[PDB]
Nucleic acid binder design. Sequence first.
DNA 1: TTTT
Length: 230
Amino acid sequence: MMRIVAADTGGAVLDETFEPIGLIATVAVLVEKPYRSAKEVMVKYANPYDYDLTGRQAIRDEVLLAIELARKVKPDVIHLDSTLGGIELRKLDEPTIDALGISDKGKEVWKELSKDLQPLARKFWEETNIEIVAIGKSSVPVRIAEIYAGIYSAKWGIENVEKEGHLIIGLPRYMEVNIKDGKIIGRSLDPREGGLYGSAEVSVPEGVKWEIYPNPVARRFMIFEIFSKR
DNA sequence: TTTT
Ligand SMILES: [Mg+2]
Ligand SMILES: [Mg+2]
């Protein structure tokens, strides 16, 4: 049946205040029936130190990665993580945005992303028939991409806790990570979603420990705290 | 809008 590509951006390095500093991973996934996991993945790491948190960088990074993965694997459709009711990105011009039911800042950021992303969605559509749709939180593949973003942020944490000495990572909404036998398994904590999961291989440098607990300043989000081999 |  329907094969979908989706992207999301989702690691977050935090300060001792538990407040975000920057995002870590952008991940595009290919999802087939039965839509609990990813057949294929593309990961692009950002620099969480010096990241734009207003949304412009994350959404732009998502569309470019997903289009890359989509051109290769040819899904039926791409799912973009922005809850705009499913309108196609190739149709998201400025007046179509100004007529949306969203916050003035929402319109301000999208219209600015529109300038370059909307023609980019149109070009890709003219040559593949593949829509990019702003479905956001009601898409299962987007949630899978989010879970993979979490997974690869754990992986990024583990492999960069040496440069740093301590690392505080905010995972995406209600998900956990487990690491056993050299691989990260991420799972949604939401039973309502139907058992979504992913995994990535990791190489854990001996001596490095980690711990998962709630973020006190962001209910429903978990902290992945990792201590350097000391 | 999106991030946690
Ligand atoms: Mg997102
Ligand atoms: Mg997300």
